[PDB]
Amino acid sequence: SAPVVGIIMGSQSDWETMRHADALLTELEIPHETLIVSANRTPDRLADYARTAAERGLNVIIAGAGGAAHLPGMCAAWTRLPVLGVPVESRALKGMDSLLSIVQMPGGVPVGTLAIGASGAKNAALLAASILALYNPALAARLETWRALQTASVPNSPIT
Amino acid sequence: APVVGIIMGSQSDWETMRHADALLTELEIPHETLIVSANRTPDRLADYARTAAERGLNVIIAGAGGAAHLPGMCAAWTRLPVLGVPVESRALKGMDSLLSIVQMPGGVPVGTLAIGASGAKNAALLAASILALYNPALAARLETWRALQTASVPNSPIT
Amino acid sequence: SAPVVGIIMGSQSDWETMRHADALLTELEIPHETLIVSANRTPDRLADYARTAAERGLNVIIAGAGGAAHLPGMCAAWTRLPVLGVPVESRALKGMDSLLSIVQMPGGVPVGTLAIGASGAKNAALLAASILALYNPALAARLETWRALQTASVPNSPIT
Amino acid sequence: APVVGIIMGSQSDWETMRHADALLTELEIPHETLIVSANRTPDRLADYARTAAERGLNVIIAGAGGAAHLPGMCAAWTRLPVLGVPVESRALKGMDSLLSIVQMPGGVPVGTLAIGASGAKNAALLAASILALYNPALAARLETWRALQTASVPNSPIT
Amino acid sequence: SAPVVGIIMGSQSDWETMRHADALLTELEIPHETLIVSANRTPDRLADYARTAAERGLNVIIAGAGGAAHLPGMCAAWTRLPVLGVPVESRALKGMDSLLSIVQMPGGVPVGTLAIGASGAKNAALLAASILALYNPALAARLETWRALQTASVPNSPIT
Amino acid sequence: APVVGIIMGSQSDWETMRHADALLTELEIPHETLIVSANRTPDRLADYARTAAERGLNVIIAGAGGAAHLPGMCAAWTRLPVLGVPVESRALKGMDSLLSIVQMPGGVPVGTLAIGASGAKNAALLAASILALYNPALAARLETWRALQTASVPNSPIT
Amino acid sequence: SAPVVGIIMGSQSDWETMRHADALLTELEIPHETLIVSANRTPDRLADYARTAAERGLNVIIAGAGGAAHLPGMCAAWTRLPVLGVPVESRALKGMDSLLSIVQMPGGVPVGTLAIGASGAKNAALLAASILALYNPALAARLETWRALQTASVPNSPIT
Amino acid sequence: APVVGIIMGSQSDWETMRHADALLTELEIPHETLIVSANRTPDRLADYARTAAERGLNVIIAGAGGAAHLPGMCAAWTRLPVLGVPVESRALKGMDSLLSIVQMPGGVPVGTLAIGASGAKNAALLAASILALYNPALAARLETWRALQTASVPNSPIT
């Protein structure tokens, strides 16, 4: 039952986006936890979350935030685990501030960044799954089936 | 046998992608380093990506610039995690590279790193952090690498 | 009755845009086919579509996609035919990701790119028509009439 | 007699547009290469574009930078397909060029290629692929060109 | 009664923006004409309009267009008169394509460019007025009064 | 006596604004060329702009880079037409300059020209075209200038 | 009762944004004044406001404006006080013109710039408070309590 | 004892941040100048920021480039005013730096200055203007500095 992925986000307003990561992990039967951790309002909460993640048994962190989106990169600063970043769409700049704040990490501290918005959340979960699948054969088979069905389900022509 | 594949769209990408190669070598991660063009050698890419898992690869690092299709198309054909490095382009400074890699639609992920050499280094570190989840000796070398990075930052600037 | 232009798009959600290409080809009496082909979900479908297009009698491909819009460029990778690309408008980045993903093809593999959105779809069809018109006199006359009427139909003053 | 016209807004565009000229010569496509400015020689452009078809041109490749009106205005006067090359500008690196060319409204197309030398080369290849539809010898030379490009990509980078 | 300013625009859809230039010229009692001239659909109409503007007694042209906005620059190519350009806001790119298509004229062929949208239309008319005011004392006094009243009419505090 | 004032925010702008100065001299338009900083010498700007008309100036050309307030603030204090030249900035290549100049709200216009040297040259030409409306000798020199520009464009590129 | 912070803005339309600065100063019991001052319509009003601010007892100016947003930088040109700038979101360019017009001040004349929109207004007030707190112990304690409560009030998980 | 802390993410930032250091020295403002990386030395940053007030610092000036988290994370841990300097980055010319610093959400401010050396100089001036509110001797030196800047602007450009 113990979580192997942590989904963290900067605010409740991020949940409309990050719920797509939660749903997909659940779909693939990946146990996980989902939390609010603010890089700017709760920096010590973040420090503790990230530095203890590995010893708590987490394998991957998915971090979502918008605007001056420091949460994924600061999480990666404190954990040796892979951290995946979801740029949450922002009001004025449409997530371009989110995206650049996350993806442009300096050499030495990676964040694997996904697309702005719900696509990115879904793909963070899928990327996490593909990481876990490397060591978990049952999950690898579920993921294979999932990817194959996605391919097989694309229609051949538009409803014109 | 290689467990990471580094692929890049052209020789011109090597100045950037060599940083990924160097990091993997530093951490003693067996890997292969190849040129594969999504646009000029699409069948080469198809074969590479579709057979990667069966050949024993665990992670693919793909770098390209401009209309950079290599990472996303690699991901389309493999179930393995694909990490993408936007190579800095001449006119648009890798913004075209970045958007063509990172903005993958839901269903086919590419874990995207920074534009340029930083991104190439970080793709290799991210690959390492993935492999470390099920390779304890590597996990310890990665811990050492991260600890040395942190400990080595000077406290004050030199003039 | 056999198609000489192929219209392909990455998803049903592209049809709201790509229908304008379909309508214009039909207006000019250009036989064509209209399909969904996903570069990221159905890469082998794309490979087969593009590599066989010429032998199937297609002369021009119009490819529409949004976001990380790889469909036109990957189509061009596998066919020797001219490929025309329509950047479909995306939600966050307003088709700028679509545009750059399509137009910035490296030297050696062209995609003739049109405007973001419905304008681009309409112009992909018109550009395809002007290509076909080079060898098809009846079509050339229909296109001449069409262009002339467009010019003649512009009003001289606004409804102020 | 020329079947492709290459036109460019100024001598400063030649460093970019020479790549189109070279490619057409390589594929033995007869063509003319001219300077025509939309803003400085608008009547020259009007005459060039309106008479292109009657002179036997099949495709026009137009390159310009900045507020780049040359391709679109060419297309306004000819029924021929017009391909546009955004020339890299000093300050905005061809983003002004790109948007002023690609964003043509419905009714007057310009098939737009990448910013810079890549775009110039690709405009010539796209013109070739158009002409190839009704010139079998050229179609075979184009097939050879594309096949050589694909076959010539190295498998691994050189240090 | 004869017009001294010409307002031209690429389409009826530009009128929602360009009407602000019309209104302001009328407010300041500047005789003018208002026309649709498309650079891309009616290039010969444009050529004739611009090359004859001076001999018809026009002193300033205000040209508004959106997207690949060639109308102001091509007008300036054919007239020696000052040409003022209004970037009409575009759907996807919010007038950034309009703006760059107008303002980035090469050395030798100026277009005096105003803000994206209605502000720009209003300011094109005001700029035209300030040009005409240089030789027309009655207009100069009307413009002085107008500018002074604008300054005097700014409130001192917000309605909080 | 000067009828055009060229003002610029700093000596660093001169490399750009000298093109305006040269063009006005070429057309024999009497003018003054000054440094006036909106941010460092705001009172100097206030006095310059408020007294420009009474001193006999007809047009002001104002160039600045970065957060470029000089043209707009000049326009705030004078009834004269103000033309603005966005000077290319180091990091953002004049996009900051452009937006801070062109986006004036309704009520206080600045006629804005291209980023850089092209814009400086064109501000002077636009000033000339304004003055030409009520100076026939100048109008004829401007006609000659435009005619020479058009006639001098080559027909084909040099290698 | 005398104001120690001045909030100025270019127009009534800025108030929807700048009210957040007003509210926060009032929340922290910081006396202040709130005015409309237009850099482009009332330049002499601005000159007088900024040059007399210090002698009137103001310690910090918060200046909000949009578009070609010159108000904060021109205020800073005339006062030795710290000036904080709020980029008000603009219609077409989403405050990017506002932001660049404010933040890119040349060396020698600072404006401390905050985020586009309401966030920036709120943070201008908070930044002003943190400046005043350096010399005002009661305010420093109120601000400490405010920051601590903000941190303590972040939820631990989303309402999923 | 220092009353301003200048912190920067790396030695590579020093070319930019030295301008802040120089200005503070010029105005005789005691300060410390340190390297602190948000991403490589997060615990160092935590300790620095949380203890700054108790150590007697009044203002922190933080400079970083790229995904620039240093100013915002500093502000997260201190009640002191934090001023942020976007360092110009190689590919995106500090636009990534700017947006990652300036776009702080309501509740945790960073007063942000221009990209590059101008921003570093202005962060130090802004810090000075803050300190001047409760240090009359400094206020007078700042007045002198601003007056000299204004008086020293030339009236006309040199060729």
User: Contacts of residue D157 in chain B, CB cutoff 8 Å?
Assistant: 8, 11, 13-14, 17-18, 33, 35
Q: E43-52 and D42-51 helices cross at what angle (nearest 10)?
A: 150
**Structure-determination technique:** X-ray
H104·G116 Cβ contact <8 A = no
E32-36 and E60-66 strand pairing: unpaired
CB pairs under 8 A between A and C: 45
DSSP classification of residue F80: S
Q: For residue F5, give how far its alpha carbon lies from the nearest alpha carbon of chain E (Å).
A: 15
Q: For residue F52, give how far its alpha carbon lies from the nearest alpha carbon of chain E (Å).
A: 13
Give the residues across from F35 on adjacent strands. F8
Closest CA to A101 of G124, B19, B130, A89: A89
- HEC states along B87-133? ECCCCCCCHHHHHHHHCCCCCCCCEECCCCHHHHHHHHHHHHHHHHH
Q: Report the alpha-carbon distance of residue B20 to residue B23 in Å, rounded.
A: 5
C-alpha of A159 from chain center = 33
Q: F70-77 and F95-102 helices cross at what angle (nearest 10)?
A: 20
Q: Report the alpha-carbon distance of residue G115 to residue G157 in Å, rounded.
A: 26
Q: Report the alpha-carbon distance of residue F51 to residue H69 in Å, rounded.
A: 48
A156·C9 Cβ contact <8 A = no
Q: Report the alpha-carbon distance of residue H64 to residue A73 in Å, rounded.
A: 14
D79·C126 Cβ contact <8 A = no
Compute how many other C-beta atoms are within 10 angstroms of the C-beta atom of residue A154: 17
Q: Report the alpha-carbon distance of residue D95 to residue D115 in Å, rounded.
A: 8
Q: Which residues of G34-58 are buried (b: 16+ CB within 10 A; e: fewer)?
A: bebbbbbbbbebbbebbbebbeeeb
Helical segments of E1-92, H only: 15-27, 43-52, 71-78
Q: Report the alpha-carbon distance of residue C37 to residue C81 in Å, rounded.
A: 17
Residues 6+ apart with CB under 8 A from B151: none
CB-based burial of residue C158 (10 Å sphere; 0-12 exposed, 13-18 middle, 19+ buried)? buried
Cβ(C136)–Cβ(C5) below 8 Å: no
Question: How many degrees, rounded to 5, is the angle at CA G67 between CA G62 and CA G72?
Answer: 25
Q: Report the alpha-carbon distance of residue E62 to residue E44 in Å, rounded.
A: 18
C-alpha of D79 from chain center = 16
Distances (CA, A) of D91 to D71, E111, F94, F100, G70: 21, 18, 7, 16, 23
Tell me, yes or no, if G84 comes closer than 8 A to chain A by beta carbon: no
User: Contacts of residue H34 in chain B, CB cutoff 8 Å?
Assistant: 155-156
Residue of A nearest to H40 (CA): A77
Read off the tokens for E88: 């009409």
Which of C36, C41, C91 comes nearest A157 by C-beta? C36
C neighbours by CB contacts (3+ pairs under 8 Å): A, B, D, E
Residue of F nearest to H154 (CA): F35
Tell me, yes or no, if A155 comes closer than 8 A to chain C by beta carbon: yes
Residue E85 parent element (H or E): strand E83-88
User: Contacts of residue D125 in chain C, CB cutoff 8 Å?
Assistant: 108-110
Cβ(G33)–Cβ(G3) below 8 Å: yes
Tell me, yes or no, if D66 comes closer than 8 A to chain F by beta carbon: yes
User: Contacts of residue C126 in chain D, CB cutoff 8 Å?
Assistant: 106-109
E92·C117 Cβ contact <8 A = yes
Question: How many degrees, rounded to 5, is the angle at CA H119 between CA H115 and CA H122?
Answer: 165
Read off the tokens for C5: 């232009």
User: Contacts of residue A115 in chain C, CB cutoff 8 Å?
Assistant: 67-68
C115·D107 Cβ contact <8 A = no
User: Contacts of residue A43 in chain H, CB cutoff 8 Å?
Assistant: 46, 73, 76-77
Tell me, yes or no, if E160 comes closer than 8 A to chain G by beta carbon: yes
Closest CA to D57 of D138, D3, D8: D3
Q: For residue D132, give how far its alpha carbon lies from the nearest alpha carbon of chain F (Å).
A: 27
Read off the tokens for C14: 């592209």
CB pairs under 8 A between C and D: 113
Residues 6+ apart with CB under 8 A from F18: F120, H157, H159
C60-66 and C112-113 strand pairing: unpaired
Closest CA to A105 of H67, H55, D154: H67
CB-based burial of residue G120 (10 Å sphere; 0-12 exposed, 13-18 middle, 19+ buried)? buried
Residues 6+ apart with CB under 8 A from G48: none
> Which residue in this structure is represented by tokens 């002004």?
D96
Helical segments of chain E, H only: 15-27, 43-52, 71-78, 96-103, 118-132, 137-152
E neighbours by CB contacts (3+ pairs under 8 Å): C, D, F, G
Tell me, yes or no, if G156 comes closer than 8 A to chain A by beta carbon: yes
Give the residues across from C9 on adjacent strands. C36, C64
Task: Say whether D96 sits in a helix, a strand or coil.
Answer: helix
CB pairs under 8 A between D and F: 44
Q: Report the alpha-carbon distance of residue D38 to residue D48 in Å, rounded.
A: 11
Tell me, yes or no, if F5 comes closer than 8 A to chain E by beta carbon: no
User: What are φ and ψ of residue A8, in 5° steps?
Assistant: -125, 150
Please spell the DSSP secondary structure of G65-121, one letter per residue. Answer: EESS--HHHHHHHH-SS-EEEEEEPPTTTTTHHHHHHHHTPPTTS--EE--SSHHHH
Please spell the DSSP secondary structure of C107-118, one letter per residue. Answer: TTS--EE--SSH
Mutate to test the interface with G, among A91, A94, A98 (most CBs of G within 10 A): A91
Q: What is the CA radius of gyration of chain H?
A: 16
User: Contacts of residue B85 in chain H, CB cutoff 8 Å?
Assistant: none
Q: Report the alpha-carbon distance of residue A83 to residue B111 in Å, rounded.
A: 10
A40·H104 Cβ contact <8 A = yes
Containing structural domain, residue D43: 1-159
CB-based burial of residue F124 (10 Å sphere; 0-12 exposed, 13-18 middle, 19+ buried)? buried
G160·A41 Cβ contact <8 A = no
E154·G42 Cβ contact <8 A = yes
Q: Report the alpha-carbon distance of residue D87 to residue D95 in Å, rounded.
A: 9
Q: For residue A130, give how far its alpha carbon lies from the nearest alpha carbon of chain G (Å).
A: 24
Q: For residue E31, give how far its alpha carbon lies from the nearest alpha carbon of chain D (Å).
A: 28
Q: Which of residues 85-144 of C touch B (CB under 8 A)?
A: 90, 93, 96-97, 100-106, 108-109
Closest CA to E68 of C124, D109, D87, C156: D109
Compute how many other C-beta atoms are within 10 angstroms of the C-beta atom of residue H135: 17
User: What are φ and ψ of residue H60, in 5° steps?
Assistant: -115, 130
B59-65 and B82-87 strand pairing: parallel
Read off the tokens for B33: 């380093």
State yes or no: chains H and D have 3 or more CB pairs below 8 A. Answer: no
- HEC states along D8-64? ECCHHHHHHHHHHHHHHHHCCCCEEEEECCCCCCHHHHHHHHHHCCCCCCCEEEEEE
Cβ(E25)–Cβ(E7) below 8 Å: yes
Which of A42, A68, A93 comes nearest G94 by C-beta? A93
Specified resolution (Å): 1.8
Task: Say whether A138 sits in a helix, a strand or coil.
Answer: helix
Which of F88, F115, F155 comes nearest D35 by C-beta? F155
H41·B153 Cβ contact <8 A = yes
Q: Report the alpha-carbon distance of residue D19 to residue D15 in Å, rounded.
A: 8
User: Contacts of residue A69 in chain G, CB cutoff 8 Å?
Assistant: none
C-alpha of C7 from chain center = 6
Q: Report the alpha-carbon distance of residue E45 to residue E51 in Å, rounded.
A: 10
Question: What is the total count of domains within chain G?
Answer: 1
State yes or no: chains A and F have 3 or more CB pairs below 8 A. Answer: no
Cβ(C63)–Cβ(C86) below 8 Å: yes
C92·A160 Cβ contact <8 A = no
Give the up-direction half-sphere exposure of residue C85: CA atoms within 13 A in the CB hemisphere. Answer: 36
Closest CA to B99 of A110, C103, D68, A111: C103
C-alpha of D105 from chain center = 19
> Which residue in this structure is represented by tokens 């307030």?
F69
Which amino acid does the sequence have at A98? S
Helical segments of F2-135, H only: 14-26, 42-51, 70-77, 95-102, 117-131
Strand order in the sheet with H59-65: G32-36, G5-9, G60-66, G83-88, G112-113, H111-112, H82-87, H59-65, H4-8, H31-35
Cβ(G17)–Cβ(G3) below 8 Å: no
User: Contacts of residue H95 in chain A, CB cutoff 8 Å?
Assistant: 100
Q: Report the alpha-carbon distance of residue F78 to residue F61 in Å, rounded.
A: 12
Closest CA to H123 of H31, H36, H37, H46: H31
Closest CA to F80 of F2, F23, F158: F2
Q: Which residues of F45-81 are buried (b: 16+ CB within 10 A; e: fewer)?
A: bbebbbebbeeebbbbbbbbbbbbbbbbbbbbbbbbb
Task: Say whether C39 sits in a helix, a strand or coil.
Answer: coil
Handedness of CA G90, G92, G96, G100 (dihedral sign): negative
Q: Report the alpha-carbon distance of residue B94 to residue B120 in Å, rounded.
A: 13
Tell me, yes or no, if F153 comes closer than 8 A to chain D by beta carbon: yes
User: Contacts of residue H115 in chain F, CB cutoff 8 Å?
Assistant: 91-92
Give the residues across from D84 on adjacent strands. D62, D112
B14·D155 Cβ contact <8 A = no
User: Contacts of residue E97 in chain D, CB cutoff 8 Å?
Assistant: 99-100, 103
CB-based burial of residue E69 (10 Å sphere; 0-12 exposed, 13-18 middle, 19+ buried)? buried
Which amino acid does the sequence have at F130? I
Q: Report the alpha-carbon distance of residue B105 to residue A6 in Å, rounded.
A: 22
Distances (CA, A) of E74 to D44, D68, H29: 13, 11, 57
CATH number of the domain at D47, please.
3.40.50.1970
Q: Which residues of H25-41 are buried (b: 16+ CB within 10 A; e: fewer)?
A: eebebebbbbbbbbbbb
> Which residue in this structure is represented by tokens 């920036």?
G120
User: What are φ and ψ of residue H53, in 5° steps?
Assistant: -65, -45
Q: Report the alpha-carbon distance of residue D103 to residue C96 in Å, rounded.
A: 11
